[PDB]
């Protein structure tokens, strides 16, 4: 239909208030990998802060 699926996320678990665990569901056949990998590669290197 040329219109994709958008997730109905289920949980933002905030254990220890500094180590969170987010779930997201559902995503298309391969969008899980691409979104996870893009977010991971951006957060690791290209995410400004101060140190």
């Amino acid at each position: 239909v040329t219109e994709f699926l958008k997730p109905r996320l289920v949980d933002i678990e905030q254990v220890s208030s500094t180590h969170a665990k987010v779930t997201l569901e559902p995503l298309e056949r391969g969008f899980g990998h691409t979104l996870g990998n893009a977010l991971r590669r951006i957060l690791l290197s290209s995410m400004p802060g101060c140190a």
Binding site: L39, I42, M47
Partner: peptide
Amino acid sequence: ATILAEQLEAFVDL
């Protein structure tokens, strides 16, 4: 997510 979307902004239509 915001940084990636504002990177993408140059190509999308809507």
